[PDB]
Amino acid sequence: KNFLETIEDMILIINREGRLLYANTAVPKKLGYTHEELMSMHILTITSAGKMAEGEKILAELFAGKKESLPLSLEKKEGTSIPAKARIWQGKWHNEPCLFAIIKDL
Amino acid sequence: KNFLETIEDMILIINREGRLLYANTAVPKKLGYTHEELMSMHILTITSAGKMAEGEKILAELFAGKKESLPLSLEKKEGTSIPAKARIWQGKWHNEPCLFAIIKDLS
């Protein structure tokens, strides 16, 4: 519960459409964005801001199983990207398929 | 959370003493042990059955921050072991330092 809130690494619950169903204290902190904002943004905006189609294909793959991990570049509200690595797990949110991701800032 | 329960990989939350604060259906299911049983057991009983001392040291390092992942041999109630890979994160349950682990069955 208020648990994940205690992990230093960034954590996100993402739905099949790329929407953030959850994020913890760390994502806003490291990205400059706000919990209010993040909860309304699309994951592709933070990651494939330039390559929407590219990112969508990958997201689709993360939902299949093809990959469990991948490197990322997180553009902050500031504009500058921070390199990172994402570890993802499949789970369910409200009985609908979602991705559980624990991301490490490199 | 009720969420974690929905991940096929084994997730445990274990304290400084090696006790199992939390575990998901995945653990009982894959290890052949029960949640009741599981809550009383010590992590080393599952990871280091014949080597408590070397197992007690690794656990020591894990909290120190030494490693972020290590391979494992999970011993099933059956008595048999399964190769696993565990990724760990340092969290805190309510108040005290503990380890958050997501374990992949490497079968």
Side-chain angles (χ1 to χ4, degrees), chain A residues 3-106, chain B residues 3-107:
Chain A
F3 180 36
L4 307 182
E5 214 82 325
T6 71
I7 291 176
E8 308 296 59
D9 262 356
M10 295 176 278
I11 302 186
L12 296 175
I13 279 68
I14 297 143
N15 70 27
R16 213 157 183 192
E17 281 205 319
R19 297 300 214 131
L20 283 51
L21 295 330
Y22 172 85
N24 59 336
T25 321
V27 201
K29 190 196 281 69
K30 310 265 290 185
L31 261 30
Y33 290 118
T34 299
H35 185 63
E36 285 65 44
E37 295 162 306
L38 245 44
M39 285 319 92
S40 297
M41 288 182 258
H42 186 292
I43 190 64
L44 255 39
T45 290
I46 299 181
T47 70
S48 303
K51 307 172 176 294
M52 292 308 161
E54 293 57 52
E56 190 169 61
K57 264 282 191 168
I58 293 308
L59 186 64
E61 286 182 50
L62 287 175
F63 268 100
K66 163 107 168 177
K67 296 163 196 154
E68 306 183 324
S69 60
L70 78 179
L72 307 173
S73 296
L74 309 185
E75 191 198 311
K76 299 186 281 181
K77 165 117 60 52
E78 116 187 354
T80 288
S81 282
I82 55 188
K85 196 176 183 181
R87 303 196 165 274
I88 76 80
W89 289 267
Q90 294 158 122
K92 291 174 175 301
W93 188 270
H94 290 161
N95 298 291
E96 283 310 310
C98 70
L99 249 34
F100 175 62
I102 307 185
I103 315 153
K104 162 161 159 280
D105 181 321
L106 308 188
Chain B
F3 178 67
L4 305 182
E5 196 65 38
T6 68
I7 298 181
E8 306 303 70
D9 281 23
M10 298 171 279
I11 289 174
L12 304 172
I13 278 82
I14 70 96
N15 65 52
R16 199 126 192 176
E17 262 221 325
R19 284 318 212 76
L20 270 55
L21 284 30
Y22 175 80
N24 61 0
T25 189
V27 192
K29 183 179 282 55
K30 307 266 280 188
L31 254 29
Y33 293 109
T34 303
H35 184 84
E36 288 55 59
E37 311 179 321
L38 251 52
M39 290 306 98
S40 296
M41 311 202 201
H42 185 286
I43 191 64
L44 270 29
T45 302
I46 313 169
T47 69
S48 323
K51 305 181 176 297
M52 300 307 144
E54 292 100 309
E56 189 173 57
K57 252 286 183 171
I58 301 290
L59 188 54
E61 300 169 21
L62 295 197
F63 276 97
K66 189 69 181 184
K67 307 169 186 174
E68 306 194 305
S69 83
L70 74 171
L72 295 173
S73 298
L74 313 184
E75 196 192 311
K76 324 206 301 175
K77 167 87 71 86
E78 177 189 56
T80 234
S81 299
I82 48 187
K85 184 170 190 182
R87 291 161 201 295
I88 77 172
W89 286 273
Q90 300 182 64
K92 285 128 105 42
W93 217 36
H94 286 150
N95 272 330
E96 304 274 274
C98 83
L99 257 27
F100 174 54
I102 310 183
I103 308 162
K104 181 178 176 193
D105 173 354
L106 304 188
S107 263

